[PDB]
């Protein structure tokens, strides 16, 4: 089924750059559209999957750690808890999906950051 993951503060969607499938590609915000690189499926294993086999993936547990796509493998850094307030928390890190520098424009990067009430850490949809 899928579903976009749209940033509240930016009104832009969680987007895989160029619809790349390459391990390590950092996530960005982009104007929402119908493509597969903006479709995210939540799984029972706690994942946010794109293209079927790729996972939203935290490269570390520290502030400013890159959020990237990576081949799904079962790691806890590929597990996320989408809260009731729209925060997306990394299970391994206890840090939140965060649009870097409170950025809102196309191309602003996504990272892990200390959970706050910033609108750059709030996301809607499935
Ligand atoms: O030297 C340092 C750099 O390494 C660092 O770069 C970042 C390192 O982290 C990168 O992201 C993580 C990469 O590792 C992933 O976990 C892997 C997934 O693959 C598993 O192996 C598979 C096992 O099954 C086999 O059949 C198959 O062949 C294998 O693929 C492996 O066991 C796991 O460890 C994590 O999910 C990622 O988070 C990140 O992209 C880099 O930027 O930067 C600092 C530098 O000093």
Swiss-Prot record:
Residues 10-126 form the Ricin B-type lectin domain. Disulfide bonds join 13-32, 55-72, 96-115. Contributes to hydrolyze hemicellulose, the major component of plant cell-walls. XLNA and XLNB seem to act sequentially on the substrate to yield xylobiose and xylose as carbon sources. It comes from the Bacteria. The gene is xlnA. It comes from Streptomyces lividans. The chain holds residues 352 to 477 of 477 of the full protein. This is Endo-1,4-beta-xylanase A. It is found in: Secreted. Belongs to the glycosyl hydrolase 10 (cellulase F) family.
């Amino acid at each position: 089924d899928g579903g976009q993951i749209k940033g509240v503060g930016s009104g832009r969607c969680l987007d895989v750059p160029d619809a790349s499938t390459s391990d390590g590609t950092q996530l960005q915000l982009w104007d929402c559209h119908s493509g597969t690189n903006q479709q995210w499926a939540a799984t029972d294993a706690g994942e946010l999957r794109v293209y079927g086999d790729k996972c939203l993936d935290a490269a570390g547990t520290s502030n400013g750690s890159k959020v990237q796509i990576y081949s799904c493998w079962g790691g806890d850094n590929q597990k996320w808890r989408l809260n009731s307030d729209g925060s997306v928390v990394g299970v391994q890190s206890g840090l939140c999906l965060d649009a870097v520098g409170n950025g809102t424009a196309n191309g602003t990067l996504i990272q892990l950051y200390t959970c706050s009430n910033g609108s750059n850490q709030r996301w809607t949809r499935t």
